[PDB]
Structure formats: C-alpha cells, structure tokens
Design an enzyme around this catalytic site. Structure first.
Site, PDB file in Angstrom:
ATOM      1  N   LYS A 186      14.382 -10.995   2.624  1.00  0.00           N
ATOM      2  CA  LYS A 186      15.157 -10.063   1.798  1.00  0.00           C
ATOM      3  C   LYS A 186      14.467  -9.728   0.479  1.00  0.00           C
ATOM      4  O   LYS A 186      14.500  -8.576   0.030  1.00  0.00           O
ATOM      5  CB  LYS A 186      16.557 -10.618   1.520  1.00  0.00           C
ATOM      6  CG  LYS A 186      17.446 -10.718   2.743  1.00  0.00           C
ATOM      7  CD  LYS A 186      18.882 -10.930   2.298  1.00  0.00           C
ATOM      8  CE  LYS A 186      19.800 -11.156   3.464  1.00  0.00           C
ATOM      9  NZ  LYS A 186      21.196 -11.095   2.997  1.00  0.00           N
TER      10      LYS A 186
ATOM     11  N   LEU B 282      28.463  -5.611  -6.545  1.00  0.00           N
ATOM     12  CA  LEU B 282      29.103  -4.311  -6.618  1.00  0.00           C
ATOM     13  C   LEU B 282      30.581  -4.464  -6.274  1.00  0.00           C
ATOM     14  O   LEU B 282      30.943  -5.158  -5.313  1.00  0.00           O
ATOM     15  CB  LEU B 282      28.430  -3.289  -5.691  1.00  0.00           C
ATOM     16  CG  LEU B 282      27.027  -2.801  -6.042  1.00  0.00           C
ATOM     17  CD1 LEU B 282      26.029  -3.770  -5.509  1.00  0.00           C
ATOM     18  CD2 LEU B 282      26.783  -1.445  -5.456  1.00  0.00           C
TER      19      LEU B 282
ATOM     20  N   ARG C 116      15.923  -6.351  14.209  1.00  0.00           N
ATOM     21  CA  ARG C 116      16.463  -6.818  15.499  1.00  0.00           C
ATOM     22  C   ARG C 116      17.623  -5.912  15.916  1.00  0.00           C
ATOM     23  O   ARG C 116      18.056  -5.032  15.150  1.00  0.00           O
ATOM     24  CB  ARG C 116      16.988  -8.261  15.367  1.00  0.00           C
ATOM     25  CG  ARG C 116      18.061  -8.428  14.285  1.00  0.00           C
ATOM     26  CD  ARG C 116      18.837  -9.726  14.404  1.00  0.00           C
ATOM     27  NE  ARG C 116      19.659 -10.006  13.223  1.00  0.00           N
ATOM     28  CZ  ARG C 116      20.933  -9.638  13.072  1.00  0.00           C
ATOM     29  NH1 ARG C 116      21.527  -8.947  14.027  1.00  0.00           N
ATOM     30  NH2 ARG C 116      21.624  -9.958  11.962  1.00  0.00           N
TER      31      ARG C 116
HETATM   32  N1  LIG Z   1      18.460 -14.937   9.376  1.00  0.00           N
HETATM   33  C1  LIG Z   1      19.280 -15.598  10.229  1.00  0.00           C
HETATM   34  N2  LIG Z   1      19.077 -16.891  10.602  1.00  0.00           N
HETATM   35  C2  LIG Z   1      19.915 -17.521  11.453  1.00  0.00           C
HETATM   36  N3  LIG Z   1      21.016 -16.928  11.996  1.00  0.00           N
HETATM   37  C3  LIG Z   1      21.323 -15.647  11.710  1.00  0.00           C
HETATM   38  C4  LIG Z   1      20.453 -14.896  10.796  1.00  0.00           C
HETATM   39  N4  LIG Z   1      20.973 -13.668  10.692  1.00  0.00           N
HETATM   40  C5  LIG Z   1      22.079 -13.624  11.462  1.00  0.00           C
HETATM   41  N5  LIG Z   1      22.295 -14.808  12.064  1.00  0.00           N
HETATM   42  C6  LIG Z   1      23.391 -15.129  13.004  1.00  0.00           C
HETATM   43  O1  LIG Z   1      23.380 -14.149  14.046  1.00  0.00           O
HETATM   44  C7  LIG Z   1      24.723 -13.842  14.433  1.00  0.00           C
HETATM   45  C8  LIG Z   1      24.951 -12.347  14.240  1.00  0.00           C
HETATM   46  O2  LIG Z   1      24.940 -12.061  12.841  1.00  0.00           O
HETATM   47  P1  LIG Z   1      26.080 -11.183  12.152  1.00  0.00           P
HETATM   48  O3  LIG Z   1      25.895 -11.176  10.652  1.00  0.00           O
HETATM   49  O4  LIG Z   1      27.395 -11.653  12.727  1.00  0.00           O
HETATM   50  O5  LIG Z   1      25.807  -9.759  12.826  1.00  0.00           O
HETATM   51  P2  LIG Z   1      24.938  -8.485  12.391  1.00  0.00           P
HETATM   52  O6  LIG Z   1      24.102  -8.840  11.186  1.00  0.00           O
HETATM   53  O7  LIG Z   1      24.197  -8.161  13.657  1.00  0.00           O
HETATM   54  O8  LIG Z   1      26.011  -7.470  12.058  1.00  0.00           O
HETATM   55  C9  LIG Z   1      25.656 -14.687  13.580  1.00  0.00           C
HETATM   56  O9  LIG Z   1      25.976 -15.879  14.311  1.00  0.00           O
HETATM   57  C10 LIG Z   1      24.793 -15.086  12.399  1.00  0.00           C
HETATM   58  O10 LIG Z   1      25.183 -16.361  11.901  1.00  0.00           O
HETATM   59  N1  LIG Z   2      25.221  -6.809  -4.234  1.00  0.00           N
HETATM   60  C1  LIG Z   2      26.362  -6.992  -3.530  1.00  0.00           C
HETATM   61  N2  LIG Z   2      27.588  -6.749  -4.046  1.00  0.00           N
HETATM   62  C2  LIG Z   2      28.734  -6.937  -3.345  1.00  0.00           C
HETATM   63  N3  LIG Z   2      28.752  -7.386  -2.069  1.00  0.00           N
HETATM   64  C3  LIG Z   2      27.572  -7.655  -1.440  1.00  0.00           C
HETATM   65  C4  LIG Z   2      26.289  -7.472  -2.137  1.00  0.00           C
HETATM   66  N4  LIG Z   2      25.304  -7.824  -1.280  1.00  0.00           N
HETATM   67  C5  LIG Z   2      25.914  -8.193  -0.120  1.00  0.00           C
HETATM   68  N5  LIG Z   2      27.257  -8.104  -0.234  1.00  0.00           N
HETATM   69  C6  LIG Z   2      28.287  -8.383   0.812  1.00  0.00           C
HETATM   70  O1  LIG Z   2      27.815  -9.287   1.812  1.00  0.00           O
HETATM   71  C7  LIG Z   2      27.618  -8.594   3.045  1.00  0.00           C
HETATM   72  C8  LIG Z   2      26.321  -9.111   3.637  1.00  0.00           C
HETATM   73  O2  LIG Z   2      25.214  -8.728   2.815  1.00  0.00           O
HETATM   74  P1  LIG Z   2      23.768  -8.963   3.474  1.00  0.00           P
HETATM   75  O3  LIG Z   2      22.724  -8.990   2.388  1.00  0.00           O
HETATM   76  O4  LIG Z   2      23.647  -7.925   4.551  1.00  0.00           O
HETATM   77  O5  LIG Z   2      23.925 -10.460   4.059  1.00  0.00           O
HETATM   78  P2  LIG Z   2      23.640 -11.047   5.536  1.00  0.00           P
HETATM   79  O6  LIG Z   2      22.179 -11.336   5.710  1.00  0.00           O
HETATM   80  O7  LIG Z   2      24.503 -12.267   5.512  1.00  0.00           O
HETATM   81  O8  LIG Z   2      24.089  -9.958   6.496  1.00  0.00           O
HETATM   82  C9  LIG Z   2      27.596  -7.110   2.706  1.00  0.00           C
HETATM   83  O9  LIG Z   2      28.094  -6.292   3.759  1.00  0.00           O
HETATM   84  C10 LIG Z   2      28.489  -7.039   1.486  1.00  0.00           C
HETATM   85  O10 LIG Z   2      29.867  -6.888   1.834  1.00  0.00           O
END
Ligand SMILES: Nc1ncnc2c1ncn2[C@@H]1O[C@H](COP(=O)(O)OP(=O)(O)O)[C@@H](O)[C@H]1O
Ligand SMILES: Nc1ncnc2c1ncn2[C@@H]1O[C@H](COP(=O)(O)OP(=O)(O)O)[C@@H](O)[C@H]1O
Ligand SMILES: Nc1ncnc2c1ncn2[C@@H]1O[C@H](COP(=O)(O)OP(=O)(O)O)[C@@H](O)[C@H]1O
Ligand SMILES: Nc1ncnc2c1ncn2[C@@H]1O[C@H](COP(=O)(O)OP(=O)(O)O)[C@@H](O)[C@H]1O
Ligand SMILES: [Mg+2]
Ligand SMILES: [Mg+2]
Lengths: 447, 447
Positions: free
Chosen positions: B119, B207, B295
């Site tokens: 990230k 945010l 992915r």
């Molecule tokens: N970087 C990561 N390392 C390990 N597990 C991950 C990672 N990113 C996502 N997962 C796992 O993969 C599954 C799908 O992720 P999720 O956030 O639910 O869906 P998506 O990001 O596809 O919308 C979840 O069980 C989540 O815990």
């Molecule tokens: N800067 C932010 N401010 C508010 N909410 C956030 C921010 N970054 C992430 N989030 C919340 O967490 C969710 C997951 O963020 P993300 O970086 O995609 O994490 P992950 O790898 O767990 O998917 C977002 O959909 C949002 O709702």
C-alpha cells in the site's frame, strides 16, 4: 391493480408465478390438493386453500373450488400456469363471469387456437403454412380415411384435437394399422381430455421442432421473442429446449416471427403464447398454438432479458406492451434440461421421498424447482419435478455450463433423468446442433 | 482462439475455489484441488479431477504453505496456479517462486505485486502518476512519537493507521487525537506482524463522508487494458465489505468514463497483467486512491451481471497468453446487480459460528445467482474466514435488484449455524440504502 392472484397450478410453475408476485408486492393465494400441502410455494404463499383430494380431476381441474377460493379470499386475478385449466375455454369464461381476471387469452381465442383442428383452419385462412392433413375431424368412413392417407402420403399421424403433453397421437405407417390407430387415439383422447375428436396429418420424418414465442396485449400490439428448438424428445414429449434455435437465419427468424405477430393481431390474441412449427428443408409448418405460458419459457427469458410471467401480469392488468419489436434483442444462448422423477432408461414414474437434495450454482445457472430434502413426490401428477436452465455468451458455453450444473445436481431417494441429461449434453451431434425430432429415440435404440 | 491451459491448481478454498473450478470446467481445463485436512469435504474438492492435501487445518500450514502448493503443481503435472483472493494471491514471493519453478502464476508479474500490492509503494506510484491519493505520511511510520505526532498535526486529527501489507479490513485503526496515537500505532504494528508478517504501517487522513467506489480493470499484460464499470461497497463493518453493488448510484456516464480511462491508462503505464481493482474513496465528486487489489475481488460477480463479462474466464484466457478480446467500446453497462455476503457469525454480536449445516436451501428464480460451496451436511470449520457464500441478484434497475434480493434472502435456509442473513434483510429494508449513496460509516452508525 392486481393486488391478489390465485395460482391455479402446482409444482415448479406455481413457484415460478409465486416468485413473480412476491417481487411485485402482489398477494398470493395457493390453491392445492390434499396431496400438495407441503409444496414449496404453498409454504411461501400468503394464503392457502385446499381445493380437493389428491387426483387432479378432483382438485386442480375442480373449476367451482378454484373460483370459490378466489371468491372467499377476494382475489382479483387467476393465473392458470400451463396444463390443467390454462387452455380450458370453459374455465376462462367462468372466471371472467365470476368477476375475476383470467391471466390468459379470451375464451373465444382459447376455443379458436387451443383446439388443434380449428387452429389449423384459422392458420390456413390467415396466411400461415401448415402440415398437409385431413383438414377437418376424421369420420367413421374408413374408405374416406384411406383416401386422406393416400392424398398426403404415409406415414401419417393421428392426432387428438384436444390433446397435449404428447398424449393422443399415434403414428400410422400403412392401411393395415389405420383403423385401430384411429380408434385407440379417440379412446385415449376421450379418457384423457374428454373430447374424442381426432384428425390426420402427414408424418414428417426429418423435421426440427421450432417454436416462436409471442406476447400480445389484446389492444393491437404484438411482438415475437425469437424462437426455441425443442427437437430432443421421447414419446413426442420435449426433453431439452434451447434458444435461439441453431441454424435459423435472421431472414427466417424475421419471416416467421412477423407471421406469428400478424396472426396475433388478426385474431385479437391476448397474453403470452407460442406458435409451434415443424421445420424442414428451410420451411416452417404450423402444427399447434399453445395459448398459455410454456414450460420452457425461461430459455427465452435468459436470451432476451424479458420476464414473461411479469409480462403476462402486465397484459392482464390492462397495460399495453411497452416492448416494441425493434427493442427485442437476442444475446447469448440458453439450454433447458427437464428434470423428471422417472427411470433414466425405462422412463416409468418414480414417486417417493427425496432423501438428499443439492442444487447447482454459478454464473448463468438457473434452477427452477419446488423440490427439497424430505419432500415426497406424489404419484398423482406429471413426473417433471424441475427445470435446469443454463445461459452462456454462446451455445458452447451454455452446454458446458449445463454439463457442470448436472454434475452438481443431487436428487437421492427417487429415480430421475439426470443421467440421461448428462448423456445428451455429452452427445457430439447435439453439440454440433440441429438434430431432428427423432434423434433421441434413435440414439437410445428405442423400439 | 488458442488452447486453454491444460491443468491448473486452485490455490484457495471455499466459494472462490468453487468459482474458479466452474470456470476451468467450462473451458475444459483440468482441475487440481489443494486443500487442508479440514477441507476434504469442500464442494470444489468433491468436484475436482485431482486433489492434494497440502497440510493440516491452520492456514499457516496449508493455504500459506508455498512449497507444498508448488510441489502439488509438479506432482499433478499442472501448468498454472490460480491463487483466488486472500492467502497467497498478493504475495510477491509466491508469484516469483511459482514462475521460477516453471508454472504460470494466474495473476500479475511479481514485480507488479510489489509495486501495487504493497500500500505504501502503490500510494507513491499513483501520486507520481498524477493520481489523487488521500493525504498521508507518504512513507512508513517510524518509532519516534514526536515525528508521528507531527505528521498527524499536518494532515489533521481524524487520522487512520494502516498496515502496508494488510487486507480484509485488518491492521487498521482510527485515531481521534494525540493521546491514542502511540498505542494505536503499536497495536496496529503488532496485529499486522502476526497477520501479514509485515509490521509496516503508514498514516492516512481519515475521511468523514466518503463512499467506497472501485473500478474493475482487465489487462492482457501485452499493452492493452479496459475498465468494467465501477462497484459501490460502502456498507461495511470493521472496514470489511458486507454488501456490494454495480453500477455505483450517482456516478454518471461521463464520470464513469473519466475514472475508468484513468485506471485503464494506469494499467498500461505500470505493465499490469490480469484482473485488478483500483479502490477509491469518493467524496465531494472526487476520487481518492486508497489501494489496488492485484487479484480478483470477492464482489466480481456484480460486474459480471451488469457487463456480461466472465472475469474468471478472462483471467484464464490472459494467463494462456491471449490478448484481450474485448475492446473498450464493446463494454456496456446493462441493469443493476447487488451482492450480499453470507457469513457464519451471530447477526448481532458477530461472533463466529462454526458448525454443521443441518438444513440448506438456496434461493432461485430469474436474476438470482448463488455463489457458495455450502450444502446440507457440510461442516463450516473454525480455522478460516466467516464468509461462506454470496447471494447476487440482478434486475433491469436497482429497485428491481433490491426487491429481488429481499425475496431471495427470505427464501434462503441455512440452519445449524448462526448467519448474517437477517442483517442483510435489515440492510435491504434500510431507507437510506434504498435512497443510495450511503457513506462508508453508515452500517456501523445504523448499528
Ligand atoms: N493482503 C492480504 N493478506 C491476507 N489476507 C487477505 C489480504 N487481503 C485480503 N485478504 C483476505 O481475503 C479475503 C477477501 O478479502 P475482502 O476484503 O473480504 O474482499 P475484497 O478485498 O476482495 O473486497 C478476506 O478473508 C480477507 O481477510
Ligand atoms: N483514509 C480513510 N478514511 C476513512 N476510511 C477509510 C480510509 N482508508 C480506508 N478506509 C476504510 O476501510 C476500508 C478498507 O480500506 P483499504 O485500504 O481498502 O483496506 P483493506 O486492505 O483492508 O481492503 C475502506 O473501504 C474504507 O471504508
Ligand atoms: N391440452 C392439455 N390438457 C391438459 N394438460 C396438458 C395439455 N397440454 C399440456 N398439458 C400438460 O401440461 C404439462 C406441460 O406440457 P408440455 O407439453 O410438457 O409442455 P409445453 O407444451 O409447455 O412445452 C404436462 O404435464 C402436460 O401433460
Ligand atoms: N405431422 C407430424 N409429423 C411428425 N411429427 C409430429 C407431427 N405432429 C406432431 N409431431 C411430433 O409430436 C410433437 C408434439 O406435437 P404437438 O402437435 O405440439 O403435440 P402436443 O399437443 O402434445 O404438444 C412434435 O414435436 C413432433 O415431434
Ligand atoms: Mg405441442
Ligand atoms: Mg480494500
């Protein structure tokens, strides 16, 4: 304005209609026999009314009980589905007279087009080619009957005018078998459909079964929704249906589609219906019209995006079609496999309790069925207990998905035709497409 | 087109393994199911051509066991491995090792996983590419709290600490002021190190009112890339998605094309290969990049319904070296699709609910799609994520999609374990969800 409808049917189609009502916020009344209290849709329905004992003649064909059910629940419309009373002109007349909307055509249209002898006459009159035949009911004069068979040329088929579902049809290959085949068909038709009326038709050896879906509002608008090929058959009953039909050119689709839409306007047809044709050497030959929704409707839904059950309800509520012909667009391909509680090899009915059940899933996979684990399939009704419909971007993908979904489908505790359907999907000639109406029985080596 | 991959290892479990399995079977690709000892009875394992046990129950010993997974490809003579989502799918070490052992990683090049999967690195790249990001530390946080307090002062005090290697909403803490900062950084680092073997954290502005809007991309790795509309995934608990939908409400044709083109351009510029998602926070008409999933995503089926594109099949075609078939102008948004994740947890306390499913019934009908490995008799293990299935409903519009979802969720039977089906029913009934455009904080506030 259709706040509450009675579903005058059972099994998979009743559930199909219920789902459509549920999505539209319409109250459902499930009318059922005493054998069908545990039907899936009966359990999902808003209200239920037992209309008679187990036999269909004493329940789902019980006109007064069905109307009474509408009466006592204060329903506005009655959906007859397919089979049973859906093409019973008497039923429609009585439902309308009782102050309820019949979700189908006017009774005069049911009597014109639902009766096969009159249907052919109306089509020969209106500019639609038909199969050469007796062009009237058959009389007892056997010299007259032989002349007909000689005009059109053996083989011929004796068909019941009030028949359906493959019942009341016997093939005649020569004079020696003509008298007894007529007599037995009249008898089979009398005991199965009332009506002992029969006619003669040229028996076509190498046609395909191609049928055209229509919707008409009864206000002068009528469209066709491409076609379906239903050539995979046993005992003149459909086993696999698919849409669009392979090898049907855009010029032929438009030719025959426009004829059917024209026929609808010329007869004032109202609702969903299907014109069925035998197709051979580039030519269509009308055999019959179903003045009702058909079993295989979902394959057309999947290729057009049109919800045919909702469209039937639109038309019944008095609303014109807001789908125009130039807005109808075929995308992809869909195949439907009928699932029947019957021996995979002998085809004799297999009632009993389903002890294990698992449905297929995935992209393009549509399972249409009321069955569940612990549900007992009763001996009283038609053997079809479900339908598996797979759609794909093209016909190869539709068939690939069907193979996959048939591999997931579990129905333990009764015999089914799932093994047969896997065999058909795996058939190299079905994979090429365009096999005729006699192919399945030939493949199975069925004498 | 060219021949498909002969045989693949599906390096995942549960619903996504079955989804990949189904794609393989349509394309005639042989399937190898690698599984833990707790997953012998998984639906895809029971359907797979070949199975290999890759270790005992804990994920660390099985689905994260790199050498076991690669060895499994070799023993079965597989040519490629599909990592699904989670587990090893965005593990660059794994992708390298897969290739160095002579197999195809059905994913991006390892280099691209390091650039865009991490990230911190992805923020850096996107900012250099001229893509708006959320204000943040623009670099990993260190151990001196004066410097960490100073970064929070600059961006402003709702801040969030985010694990660079995190996923699934894990390794993320919101910080409201100075007092909470040290402990929050420390806890986030420790959680990240245990979950993702990477204790790198960064700081981002938190945010208040954005929506989660993400763009699907597909690149062949040969220099061609397209986008496939967007999805809204703002309904969340613990920063993990609960409901997803496509298209995103309030996104215009013009806006969709603006963000889509930029994402597609980004793919070409970084040499992306395969399916991917760019995830944004959408606030005040502006998109702010947060991460890229290098992915397939869980919610890919909503995009499939509204575009007709089979995203898994496209992954497999691309891995076979096929250039993109689909040109941008061929991509058309039709209708609306909603996904409700089904999880084995208490609907109100969200406590995990492992156990035997004693009764199961899937919803059916027009426009209903069910993506799950679950069956009556199946035991949900305690070792893995709570997500046991996905229900996806399509309609000609969002109102239709949502009414269909309501009805489908009502039909669904899963007895024996607790599930969130009843929460999804509440969500479909929520007046503000019905309105659309609810922000990322809404579900937890509603609760
Ligand atoms: N970087 C990561 N390392 C390990 N597990 C991950 C990672 N990113 C996502 N997962 C796992 O993969 C599954 C799908 O992720 P999720 O956030 O639910 O869906 P998506 O990001 O596809 O919308 C979840 O069980 C989540 O815990
Ligand atoms: N800067 C932010 N401010 C508010 N909410 C956030 C921010 N970054 C992430 N989030 C919340 O967490 C969710 C997951 O963020 P993300 O970086 O995609 O994490 P992950 O790898 O767990 O998917 C977002 O959909 C949002 O709702
Ligand atoms: N005229 C009729 N009278 C009574 N039942 C009928 C009639 N026509 C069809 N059926 C019944 O309705 C059901 C569906 O008919 P079938 O021929 O299988 O489907 P379709 O014509 O819709 O393709 C079958 O059980 C069949 O026996
Ligand atoms: N003239 C004919 N020649 C050959 N086969 C026929 C003919 N008429 C009917 N059939 C066979 O019977 C099937 C059903 O015909 P149809 O008249 O629609 O009967 P039903 O009323 O049972 O639906 C056709 O698909 C075809 O296989
Ligand atoms: Mg017929
Ligand atoms: Mg994310």
């Amino acid at each position: 304005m259709l706040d509450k409808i009675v579903i005058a049917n059972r099994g998979e189609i009743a559930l199909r209609i219920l789902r459509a009502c549920k999505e539209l916020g319409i109250k459902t009344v499930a009318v059922h026999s005493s054998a069908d209290r545990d039907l899936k849709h009966v359990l999902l329905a808003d209200e239920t009314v037992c209309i008679g004992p187990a036999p269909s003649v004493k329940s789902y064909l019980n006109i007064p009980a069905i109307i009474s059910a509408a009466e006592i629940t204060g329903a506005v419309a009655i959906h007859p589905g397919y089979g049973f009373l859906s093409e019973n002109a008497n039923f429609a007349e009585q439902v309308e007279r009782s102050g309820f909307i019949f979700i189908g055509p006017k009774a005069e249209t049911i009597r014109l087009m639902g009766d096969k002898v009159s249907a052919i006459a109306a089509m020969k009159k209106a500019g639609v080619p038909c199969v050469p035949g007796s062009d009237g009911p058959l009389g007892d004069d056997m010299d007259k009957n032989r002349a007909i068979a000689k005009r059109i040329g053996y083989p011929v088929i004796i068909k019941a005018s009030g028949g359906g579902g493959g019942r009341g049809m016997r093939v005649v290959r020569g004079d020696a078998e003509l008298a007894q085949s007529i007599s037995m068909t009249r008898a089979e038709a009398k005991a199965a459909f009332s009506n002992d009326m029969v006619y003669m038709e040229k028996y076509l050896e190498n046609p395909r079964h191609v049928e055209i879906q229509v919707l008409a509002d009864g206000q002068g608008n009528a469209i066709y929704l491409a076609e379906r090929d239903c050539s995979m058959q046993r005992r003149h009953q459909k086993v696999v249906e698919e849409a669009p039909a392979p090898g049907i050119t855009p010029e032929l689709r438009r030719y025959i589609g426009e004829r059917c839409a024209k026929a609808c306007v010329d007869i004032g047809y109202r609702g969903a219906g299907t014109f069925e044709f035998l197709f051979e050497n580039g030519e269509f030959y009308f055999i019959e019209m179903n003045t009702r929704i058909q079993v295989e409707h979902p394959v057309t839904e999947m290729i057009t995006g049109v919800d045919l059950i909702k469209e039937q309800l639109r038309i019944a509520a008095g609303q014109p079609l807001s789908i125009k012909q130039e807005e109808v667009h075929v995308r992809g391909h869909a195949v439907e496999c009928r699932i029947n509680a019957e021996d995979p090899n002998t085809f004799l009915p297999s009632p009993g309790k389903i002890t294990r059940f698992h449905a297929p899933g995935g992209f393009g996979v549509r399972w249409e069925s009321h069955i569940y684990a612990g549900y007992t399939v009763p001996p009283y009704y038609d053997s079809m207990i479900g339908k598996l419909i797979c759609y794909g971007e093209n016909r190869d993908v539709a068939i690939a998905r069907m193979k996959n979904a048939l591999q997931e489908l579990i129905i333990d505790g009764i015999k089914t035709n799932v093994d047969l359907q896997i065999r058909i999907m795996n058939d190299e000639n079905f994979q090429h497409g365009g096999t005729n109406i006699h192919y399945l029985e030939k493949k199975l080596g069925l004498q």
